[PDB]
Amino acid sequence: TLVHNWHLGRRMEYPYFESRPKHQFAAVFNINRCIACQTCTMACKSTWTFNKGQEFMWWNNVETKPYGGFPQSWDVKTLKLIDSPDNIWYTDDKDKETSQYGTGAPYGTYEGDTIFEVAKKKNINQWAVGYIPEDKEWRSPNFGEDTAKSSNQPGEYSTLPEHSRWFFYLQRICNHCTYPGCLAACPRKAIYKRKEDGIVLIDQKRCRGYRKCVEQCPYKKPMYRGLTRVSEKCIACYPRIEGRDSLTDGRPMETRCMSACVGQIRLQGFLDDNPKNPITWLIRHQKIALPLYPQFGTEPNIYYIPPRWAPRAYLRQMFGPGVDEAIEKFMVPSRELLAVMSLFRMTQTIVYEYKIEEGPKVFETEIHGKKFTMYNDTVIGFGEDGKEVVRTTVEEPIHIRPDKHYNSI
Amino acid sequence: AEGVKGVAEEELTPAKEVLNVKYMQIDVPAHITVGALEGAFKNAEGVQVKLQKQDKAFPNGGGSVNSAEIKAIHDGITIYFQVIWDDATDNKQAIATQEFRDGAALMFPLGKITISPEEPFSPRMGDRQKPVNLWHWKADWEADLLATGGIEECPARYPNMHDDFSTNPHSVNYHKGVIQSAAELSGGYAAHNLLSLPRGRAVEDLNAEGFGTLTSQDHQDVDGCSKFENKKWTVVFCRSLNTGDPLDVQFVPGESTYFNMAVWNGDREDRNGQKNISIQWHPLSLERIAWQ
Amino acid sequence: FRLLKPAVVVDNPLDTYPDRRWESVYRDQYQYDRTFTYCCSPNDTHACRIRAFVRNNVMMRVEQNYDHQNYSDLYGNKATRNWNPRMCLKGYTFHRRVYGPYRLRYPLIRKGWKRWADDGFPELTPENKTKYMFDNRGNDELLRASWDEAFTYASKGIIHITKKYSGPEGAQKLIDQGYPKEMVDRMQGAGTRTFKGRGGMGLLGVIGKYGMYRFNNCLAIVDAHNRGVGPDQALGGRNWSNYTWHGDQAPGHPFSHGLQTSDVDMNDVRFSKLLIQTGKNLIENKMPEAHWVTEVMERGGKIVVITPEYSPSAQKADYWIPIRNNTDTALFLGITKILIDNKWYDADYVKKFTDFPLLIRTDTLKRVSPKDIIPNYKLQDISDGPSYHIQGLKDEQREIIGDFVVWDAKSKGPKAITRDDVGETLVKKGIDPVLEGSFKLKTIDGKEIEVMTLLEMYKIHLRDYDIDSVVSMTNSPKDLIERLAKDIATIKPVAIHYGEGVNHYFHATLMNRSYYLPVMLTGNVGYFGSGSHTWAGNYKAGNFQASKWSGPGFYGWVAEDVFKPNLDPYASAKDLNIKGRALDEEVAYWNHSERPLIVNTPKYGRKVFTGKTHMPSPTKVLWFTNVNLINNAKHVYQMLKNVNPNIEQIMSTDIEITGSIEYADFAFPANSWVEFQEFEITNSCSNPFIQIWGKTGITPVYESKDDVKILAGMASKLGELLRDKRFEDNWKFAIEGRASVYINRLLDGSTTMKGYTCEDILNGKYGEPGVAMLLFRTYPRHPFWEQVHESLPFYTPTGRLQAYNDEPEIIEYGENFIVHREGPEATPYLPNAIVSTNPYIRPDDYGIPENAEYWEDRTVRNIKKSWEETKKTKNFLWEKGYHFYCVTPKSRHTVHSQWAVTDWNFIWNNNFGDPYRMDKRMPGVGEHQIHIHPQAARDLGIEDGDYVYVDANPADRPYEGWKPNDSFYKVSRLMLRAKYNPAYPYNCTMMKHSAWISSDKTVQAHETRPDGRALSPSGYQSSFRYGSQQSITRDWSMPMHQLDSLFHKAKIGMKFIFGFEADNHCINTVPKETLVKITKAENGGMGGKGVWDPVKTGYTAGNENDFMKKFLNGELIKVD
Ligand SMILES: Nc1nc2c(c(=O)[nH]1)N[C@@H](/C(S)=C(/S)[C@H](O)COP(=O)(O)OP(=O)(O)OC[C@H]1O[C@@H](n3cnc4c(=O)[nH]c(N)nc43)[C@H](O)[C@@H]1O)C=N2
Ligand SMILES: Nc1nc2c(c(=O)[nH]1)N[C@@H](/C(S)=C(/S)[C@H](O)COP(=O)(O)OP(=O)(O)OC[C@H]1O[C@@H](n3cnc4c(=O)[nH]c(N)nc43)[C@H](O)[C@@H]1O)C=N2
Ligand code: HEM
Ligand code: SF4
Ligand code: SF4
Ligand code: SF4
Ligand code: SF4
Ligand code: F3S
Ligand SMILES: [Ca+2]
Ligand SMILES: [Ca+2]
Ligand SMILES: [Mo]
């Protein structure tokens, strides 16, 4: 069954016919702001994987690229199973138009084989290529922390556009893929994708610990629980999204790992066809946030703003060809992006639409070869019904107090 | 149809050698053990079943075991099947992510049928609107029966482990009560999945209407014991001839039905379709009771 | 009877699923009953406001409150939502510590001390010390005590020991033990001055923790009982310092501007447009506020990081400047030279507000004094000026501080100016100083003297800091130095941020002074987004700021008259009798083997470099709360082996068994932040918020009390044994369960908090039901804002930012100018050498040869030497193989000794974390690691993941007099795993600060337990197999930090002082002045066989295979 994947800009081989959700659970991670505090990591741990049998399980992990990973060297291990000289992107016939929800070819066309198509061509008699990480490969969740790549020449120093000595942080959960490898792997069809929000779940009543999801998931999110003799995965905290936490008063709430983000890098919502949704705007209209390893062919739905300082060659191989234009937009933010970026982690309630009330200009200069102007706009976020749920300003106010008070103390 | 081969005629025609269940008053203790039944099965005659890799559907696996001996005896009250195959490794637990269990299973068509290419009933775990009963023996369940809680837990696999809540000798009463409550344990334990609970049993009684459709029964009726010695497994299945569950195979002395077999080797990572299958239904006949 | 569905059929998992009733599994797990709010206050410096979720009265998880929008002050000013969410990973796992296996459960007393107390407190001869196990406290047993029993033994011991060393007979006992006469004379006959009471970083809770300073004050009564003296002649305990002891103060700040610390509310940093970071990891050590810096690259700002390593803060930098360690003074001197050669300075901003226009005399190197050139001169009457009415100057002080001379441009000739005549005050008068010029003058005596501008003197000073030599000193790219030099000159606001990456080296004082030079000239001090700032823990006890209109402030709680306490609940803070009788002391003297800086000079025999104001006293009793003092103490195994056995009573209040308890005599279980049964107040220096919390969490998990009651219970037993009621009077409202009285007495009486009520703040009157905002002049509190915008003087002798210091000790030390100096140990060249040829630097070498290897000799060797001559010198340690720096920065995974052992955080701080502990050699679910450059390890035959020994100067560390066969040497020598990180230079190694140190019992258990876990039978867990990160560290006694004539501002009051102030101009400890030797210890492979498993992959840094190199270069994917 050929299916359309807009990340690859191509039709793809999948066991099941294409059936997209009404809207897709998605999020944007601004890697440039990340600090690797692993606050999101402890958010998921203290909530879902804190008990017996899940001691090695870290559904949310932030890893130091390029050497780091959980499980150890997970990207390189899977990328080797699809290594071919034909894994190439072609950018010329990339859509100029912004295509409708679930369609199009924004980044171009990737003519390399996905994990499903590699399995098909070799006739390996499995739905996808993969491996089961051994229990020793699940050790060291912070493997390669703050380990940089170096040119190893004596006069080495780091400057823009690309740092000679460099490393960045990759924040990973279950991508809740449109065509997940784990769902196709399970022969019992015990993994299913919800049509309401696109959340992928393992049926704990029907799972039999077949480890095929663990085997064929290229992102290694499904993990086998020794105690229960069945596998578990990130549930996208679906009770919080279903509005079952009284803190958001029945409104859909961002997942627990997203709400925890300290360096205000992640915004969680849904991929609509609405261009006024800050999630849909960033991913399809600005193309500033890009999926993690679209080479695999699962259509991940966690999109990243690439680091401004990392080697562009490494970044394209990880996020596709859209990296160059995403960084150009970020380093000198447009007026509307800076206001939308100032919306990240201002509330825990999911915001479905944004709109801006304009304010006075505060600062302007020329930077990175072009002119940047900044205004103190007020960005506003709205809920599922159009009700306002959040509001903040781009620039901080200043208060002056009676002279009986002092600062120099 | 991508991941599955067409059903070949060799699969649809039943085998020719018949497995005869010999009638013999079986005197057994409470705790049934393979040794306790060895004297009985010695007087029965068994069929040598041929085993093959499962190549017919995705996933493909197996090939580690090629043959298995099967014998069967009955009381007029209880039926016992003994299955023997050679395997060099004792895989008795599946707690580590890379480890799998050795297993064996028998399957029976539910209800009374005659199978032929003209009246086909697929041996691939049944087929749609043609249900089947399954008896799945699990080696780890044998080890769970001997654990202090009816199930082996993680320290049995990782004896050096430490957890600040579960391995804390100073845990307050109400803290541990909430944290290790069924709701907070979650997963199979909260969802009452059998693979996560102390079943007090070694064989799972389950049904299927084809492969990819295997379903665990609500009322478990089959039990069994096992023995691994000198690179060989000996497993016997124990079930009453008749049970109150309509989804159970019903045996009648003097009646004949069919059966099929499969074996798993955890050393070669056998789970699901990676099973050492028999490709054909095998005939089964029950002797009449020697009424005094 | 209805037809059964025998099996469940699924068609397309993408489209539809037959049954989803199971999904309640996770919804049942996420369910909670109630929510509550507290404040996490572990010396984070953030004091986050926390919302925890409870299920059936069990604290299950936590989440941010998302409450900053609601924060407001008395005036109605409010905060923004841009402050959200702001929490750390350690905040999320605090409950794992609350219900954890390392928790303190009941009061503890050591067997060999209760034994000593039961035998009548006999004289502690060496025979008695070994018998009662004072020399070996790590192989004794900690026994359970009831609170009354624990209090009674402790109180009896306090009375005995304070009476033991009180008299003249006590003074001679201290001379017989080897203490200097200066330390015994400081006691002044008080035995209680041997009691050292430390409230550890009391701003975390002022009532519960700074109450220790109140306890110390109360001990004056015990002194009255011991010696039979009157209230005025009675002296109590000595308050142990916090800010300086940790090395957190920037020592140059009292010299440059005369204030304790220049820091900002970090929302202000996001106003900066070129932001410079020199000695600080803002990304890993101020994480909840780090978004204020990361977002500067998004609003037209430029970020600069100047570190030897490519740190997590370097990612965010526009350009990273590598530098050699302990050399930043030279870098900013070179940039200052570039700013002055090209006149890229705001002449107007430096004519005002700065000492550069002030003229300097050549005979004495002091600034010229109008008394010296004006006949019959009188000092101007500035009694109506802002130095008396705002800053609180006294006539006796003004007389010493004097007046200074400037050369007016309008009337050619010397002009006399005052401290208050700063900023726009000179334009209102006739003065228009000249920045340049060398003038001939004649004294009143007729003796001609040459006087020239500091800028002229700087112009001649900066000839040794040419762009090429500074690159030879700093190994920094010359293009980046000129790039930063230009950026500082073309951008406004410019801000320089630093921390203990540079403050933990000996010459930090010079470095911090160096950190104002480029910012004084460019006009970037006092304006939003600008300044030169240091970052540290939460030190600002001066938030309870005392003044005339306000009141006693912090003194109301800690310096209330013990013999005249106010027992009226409705007492205004101005109705309190303020008289403290606890003499502040710096902790580092204890860390210095209980000795001041005394060196037996060959030129002037035995000379003491410690000022009288800084003089310590012998430590015989010790008690500390909210600190892991011994575990986190520097040179720890020396402290345990040769220093602490002579401390007769060691006591610790804590919530966990920390290894400081393991080597202590008493342990008192306190309530954690979620089990507070009484209200508590805290503030921060990085945020303007006030958080008050208590009684709203869970009931105490074990037999714990609030710190306020532990202090009161200790005082009550002292009163019960001494038949004195005045003890309970000083803790009356604490005992009665009403600490809000003391909190109100602190709110009222503080410049930032008078008008606030504890009851009102706690109820949501200003927004959140636990938060308000303290009252500075500006919401983004920026230091010196009122000084530049309203033309007010700084807190220096000149009232101006100072690039020069004329105090006599400073000139004798050779540091009157901002000069670059090599470290006494952390340099490849001559230790403590002065790199300059300036004839105006005239230091005294003290006749100490350049061969001197003794640390106290190297401390005071002030030898001037040119840079070209210095490059040919040689550090003795560097040439014997100890040629690796060893930085001990702080980590994102710990707050010092907190969360360093919590399993979840303990798994992530290292490359080796494993909850199942498959490698039994691993100390716990984690082990501490050392970072080393791959080539460096390969040259010593060390592969990534191998165990390595970290050895330092044998003479000094791990402990003096060690021998390879001592049982304690096995405990002291550090053996940790090595980690390849090519982000570091060849000669630089890194260990994160504060894991739980190896003790006797952890080593015994690591070698006895089958699983190999380093877990003491007491429950204490070490993070190392052997040794600690404090095995290669030492205390350095700075002569520059022990001055008696440093006119700076008192931290707590709007007033001035001379000499030492605890946490304000005292010893600033330096753990990074060290070099280490690395040698392979054991193979990293499991069981000691082969190599550590990830190296076999070929996917490791320094061991990349051709495929990984294809990965690292992004060659796996091509576009067009
Ligand atoms: N080689 C080297 N040496 C160095 C440094 C370095 O970088 N390298 N750095 C310095 C510096 S800057 C610092 S800030 C110190 O490590 C911090 O000192 P501290 O002992 O207070 O940390 P800590 O986190 O342990 O203080 C908290 C302790 O109190 C416990 N606690 C936590 N909450 C409470 C409470 O509510 N009440 C009470 N009574 N105790 C509580 C806590 O468990 C810990 O023991 C110092 N030396
Ligand atoms: N989450 C969390 N937050 C916290 C703490 C925590 O433990 N956890 N600690 C507290 C406290 S009490 C403190 S004092 C601060 O975090 C200290 O952090 P800081 O970054 O300034 O020291 P650090 O030792 O890390 O040094 C910073 C960088 O300077 C490098 N360095 C070291 N030597 C030099 C040198 O000679 N020159 C230069 N230019 N840089 C040098 C150092 O490697 C580090 O990158 C409050 N914040
Ligand atoms: C060509 C023949 C067969 C194929 C392609 C096949 C395929 C599969 C598949 C896809 C599954 C997992 C999906 C599910 O559980 O519904 C499975 C599981 C299973 N089958 Fe079949 N099957 C075949 C024959 C058999 C036979 C002859 C038996 C013997 C009774 C059998 C017994 C079982 C058992 C016990 C399991 C569960 C395995 C476990 O829980 O670890 N199957 N098989
Ligand atoms: S990331 Fe892995 S587990 Fe998550 S949906 Fe995709 S394939 Fe499934
Ligand atoms: S989305 Fe929810 S379940 Fe998944 S990692 Fe984040 S917090 Fe955990
Ligand atoms: S909380 Fe946010 S900034 Fe911190 S590690 Fe996670 S994603 Fe990165
Ligand atoms: S640990 Fe520090 S940053 Fe984290 S919540 Fe507590 S106070 Fe805030
Ligand atoms: S393959 Fe299926 S049976 Fe469970 S372990 Fe994975 S969801
Ligand atoms: Ca086997
Ligand atoms: Ca049944
Ligand atoms: Mo600190």
Backbone angles phi, psi at A141, to 5 degrees: -60, -25
Q: Are B121 and B208 in contact (CB under 8 A)?
A: no
Q: Which two tokens stand for residue B45?
A: 């005659």
Residue B188 covered by a domain: no
Burial class (CB in 10 A: 0-12, 13-18, 19+), B197: middle
Instruction: List the structure tokens of C819.
Output: 């000069």
Closest CA to C842 of C464, C364, C327: C364
Q: Do A244 and A113 fall within a single domain? A: yes
- Whether residue C775 and residue A398 make contact (CB cut-off 8 A), yes or no, is no
Nearest by CB to residue C1116, choosing from A87, A247, A409, is: A87
Determine, yes or no, domain membership for B16: yes
Q: Is the dihedral of CA C317, C322, C326, C330 positive or negative?
A: negative
User: Could you write out the DSSP letters of every residue in C706-775?
Assistant: -HHHHHHHHHHHHHHHHT-SHHHHHTHHHHTT--HHHHHHHHTT-TTTBTB-HHHHTTTTTSSTTEEE--
- Cβ of residue C916 closer than 8 Å to a chain B Cβ: yes
Q: Are the beta carbons of C628 and C899 closer than 8 angstroms?
A: no
Give the burial string for C31-47 (b: 16+ CB within 10 Å, else e).
bbeeeebbbbbbbbbbb
Burial class (CB in 10 A: 0-12, 13-18, 19+), B6: exposed
Question: Do A225 and A329 sit in the same domain of this protein?
Answer: yes
Flag whether C325 is in a domain: no
Domain-embedded: residue B179: no
Q: Judge if A69 and A194 occupy the same domain.
A: yes
C906 and C1024, same domain (yes or no): yes
What is the secondary structure of C35-55 as a DSSP string? EEEEE--SS-SS--EEEEEEE
C813 Cα distance to chain centroid: 25
Tell me if A266 CB under 6 Å of ligand 6: yes
A16 is an annotated ligand-binding site residue: no
CA dist C416 and C418 (Å) reads: 7
Same domain, C915 and C955: yes
Is there a single domain that holds both residue C63 and residue C143?
no
Q: Where are the alpha helices (DSSP H) in A276-333?
A: 278-280, 312-319, 323-331
Q: How far is C-alpha C359 from the chain's CA centre?
A: 36
Tokens of B157: 């696999």
Question: Are C290 and C311 contacting, i.e. CB atoms less than 8 angstroms apart?
Answer: no
Tell how far the Cα of B266 is from the centroid of ligand 9, in angstroms: 5
Is there a contact between C9 and B172 if contact means CB atoms under 8 Å apart? no
Contact A365, C273 (CB under 8 A): yes
Testing ligand 6's pocket by substitution, the residue of A58, A59, A63, A171 carrying the most ligand atoms inside 8 A of its CB is A171
The residue among C459, C478, C503 that closes a domain is: C459
Residue C692's CB is within 10 A of a number of other CB atoms, namely: 22
**Residue B267 located in a structural domain:** yes
Q: DSSP character for C4?
A: P
DSSP reduced 3-state for C225: helix
- CB burial readout C278-317, b (16+ within 10 A) else e: bbbbbbbbbbbbbbbbbbbbbbbbbbbbbbbbbbbbbbbb
Assigned token pair, C771: 């938060």
Per the domain annotation, does A408 fall within a domain?
no
Whether C680 and C659 map to the same domain: the answer is no
For residue C310, the 8-state DSSP code is -
Q: Which domain holds residue B213?
A: 9-151+202-286
Structure tokens at C267: 């929302």
Resolution in A: 3.0
Strand (E) positions, A226-288?
230-232, 266-271
Q: Please identify, by atom number, the ligand 6 atom nearest to the C-alpha of residue A38.
A: 5
Instruction: Provide the strand spans (E) within C159-255.
Output: 195-199, 238-239
Instruction: Give the closest-approach CA distance of C1012 to chain B in angstroms.
Output: 8
Co-location of C24 and C144 in the same domain: no
Alpha helix positions (H), A190-344: 212-216, 238-241, 256-259, 278-280, 312-319, 323-331, 335-341
How, if at all, do strands C108-110 and C58-64 pair? Answer: unpaired
| A347, A283: one domain | no
CB B58 within 8 A of CB A127: yes
Q: Are C959 and C973 in contact (CB under 8 A)?
A: no
CB of B222 closer than 8 Å to CB of B203: yes
Neighbour-count burial of C343, counting CB atoms closer than 10 A to its CB (0-12 exposed, 13-18 middle, 19+ buried):
exposed
Count of alpha carbons within 13 Å of A235, Cβ hemisphere only?
27
Return the closest-CA partner of residue B75 out of B279, B262, B251. B251
Contact A186, B213 (CB under 8 A): no
- Residue C727, CA atoms < 13 Å, CB-side half-sphere: 25
C290 vs A34: CA distance, rounded Å: 9
- C169 and C117, same structural domain? yes
Which residues in chain C are followed by a discontinuity, with C-to-N distance exceeding 2.5 angstroms? none
Domain hosting A78: range is: 2-336
The structure tokens listed for C539 are: 């030190």
Q: Are residues A205 and A137 in the same domain?
A: yes
Method: X-ray
C interface test, pick of B162, B176, B184, B217 with most C CB neighbours within 10 Å: B162
Residue B269 belongs to domain with CATH number? 2.60.40.1190
The token duo for C788 is 């530049």
> What's the rounded Cα separation, in Å, for the pair C254 and C1051?
11
- Report yes or no on A398 lying in a domain: no
Are A292 and A371 members of one domain? no
Does C581 share its domain with C722? yes
Same domain membership, residue A374 and residue A278: no
Instruction: State how far residue C1108 is from chain A, nearest Cα, in angstroms.
Output: 7
The response to whether C758 counts as a known ligand-binding position is no
Decide: helix, strand or coil at residue C398. helix
Q: Is residue C113 part of a domain?
A: yes
- Residues C1108 and C1012 occupy one common structural domain: yes
State the pairing for strand pair C621-625/C195-199: parallel
C179: which residues sit within 8 A by CB, 6+ positions away?
C594, C618
Report the CATH number at residue C1096.
Answer: 2.40.40.20
Residues A321 and A364 in one domain: no
Distance of alpha carbon A271 from alpha carbon C1012, whole angstroms = 51
Tell me how far apart the alpha carbons of residues A119 and A127 are, in angstroms, rounded to a whole number: 6
Please give the Cα distance from A146 to A157 (Å, whole number): 17
Alpha carbons A320 and B63: distance in angstroms, whole number: 42
Q: Which residues, at least 6 apart from C528, have a Cβ–Cβ distance to it below 8 Å? A: A398, C268, C271, C493, C778, C780, C782, C785
Same domain, C981 and C919: yes
Residue B166 maps to a domain: no
**Looking at the structure, do residues A271 and A169 belong to the same domain, yes or no?**
yes
The structure tokens 């009621």 sit at C725
User: Touching check for B154 and chain C: CB below 8 Å?
Assistant: yes
Q: How far apart are CA A71 and CA A218, in angstroms?
A: 11
Helix (H) or strand (E) holding C555: helix C555-558
Q: Is the peptide bond before C958 cis (omega within 30 degrees of 0)?
A: yes
> How remote is the C-alpha of C283 from its chain's centroid?
18
Does one domain contain both C566 and C691? no
Which residue, C415, C442, C459, sits at the end of a domain? C459
* Cβ–Cβ under 8 Å, residues C259 and A270: no
In a domain, C727, yes or no: yes
**Ligand 5 center to C895 CA (angstroms):** 25
Burial class (CB in 10 A: 0-12, 13-18, 19+), A274: middle
Q: Are residues C989 and C1107 in the same domain?
A: yes
DSSP string, C526-539: SSTT-EEEE--SS-
Residue C441: give the domain boundaries.
348-459
In a domain, A399, yes or no: no
Cα angle for residues C803, C809, C812 (degrees, 5° grid): 90
How far apart are the C-alpha atoms of C1048 and C392, rounded to whole Å? 12
A347 is annotated as contributing to ligand binding: no
When computed from its CA atoms, the radius of gyration of chain A, rounded to whole angstroms, is: 22
What gap in Å lies between CA C277 and CA C515, rounded to an integer? 11
Q: Domain count of chain B?
A: 1
Query: What burial letters (b/e) apply to B114-127, b meaning 16+ CB within 10 Å?
Result: ebeeeeebbbbbbb
Q: How many Cα neighbours within 13 Å face the side chain of A71?
A: 26
Number of domains chain A contains: 2
Q: Count the neighbouring beta carbons within 10 Å of the beta carbon of residue A327.
A: 21
Nearest to residue A1, comparing CAs of A12, A9, A10? A12
**HSE-up (13 A, CA, CB side) for residue C531:** 29
Residue A404 lies in a domain: no
Strands in B54-201 per DSSP E:
67-74, 78-86, 103-109, 132-138
Give C468's contacts (C-beta < 8 A, 6+ positions apart): C478
Tokens of C884: 């690796």
Is any atom of ligand 3 closer than 6 Å to the C-beta of B131? Answer: no
Structure tokens at B265: 């080797």
- Which residues sit opposite C606 in a β-bridge? C600
Same domain, A244 and A386: no
Of chain A, the end-to-end C-alpha distance in Å amounts to: 71
Residue that the structure tokens 């430590």 belong to? C619
Both A162 and A288 in a single domain? yes
What does each C-alpha distance from A146 to A142, C766, C892 come to in angstroms? 9, 42, 11
**Cβ neighbour number for residue C679 with a 10 Å cutoff:** 25
Cα distance between residue C712 and residue C719, in whole Å: 10
Coil/strand/helix, residue C102: coil
Do C914 and C1007 sit in the same domain of this protein?
A: yes
Q: Please indicate whether, in this complex, the C-beta atoms of C99 and B172 are within 8 angstroms of each other.
A: yes
Per the domain annotation, does B250 fall within a domain?
yes
Mutate to test the pocket of ligand 4, among A293, A298, A301 (most ligand atoms within 8 A of CB): A298
Cβ proximity of A46 and A259 under 8 Å: no
- Could you tell me if B11 and B127 are in contact, meaning their C-beta atoms sit under 8 angstroms apart? no
- Cβ atoms within 10 Å, residue A251: 16
C-alpha distances out from residue A271 to A102, A342, C78, C390, Å? 9, 19, 35, 59
Distance, in Å, from the CA atom of C876 to the CA atom of C860, rounded to the nearest integer, reads 17
Strand order through the sheet with A388-393: A353-357, A378-382, A388-393
Overall domain count for chain C: 4
CA distances (Å), origin C273, targets A34, C294, C519: 20, 12, 14
- The candidate with the shortest Cα–Cα distance to C1000, out of C689, C637, C716, is C637
Q: H or E segment at C550?
A: none
Nearest residue on chain A to C321, alpha-carbon basis: A157
DSSP letter string, C415-443: EEE-SS--TTHHHHSS--B-SS-EEEEE-
Residue corresponding to tokens 């797990």: C29
Specify the residue with its C-alpha closest to ligand 4, atom 4.
Answer: A174
CATH code for the domain in which residue A72 is found: 3.30.70.20
The answer to whether residues A276 and A367 belong to one domain is no
Measured between beta carbons, the chain A residues lying within 8 angstroms of B191 are 204-205
- Give the full edge-to-edge strand order of the sheet including A24-30: A266-271, A24-30, A302-305, A290-291
Q: What would the two tokens of residue C827 be?
A: 């340099």
Residue type, C563: F
Cross-chain Cβ contact B160/C9 below 8 Å? no
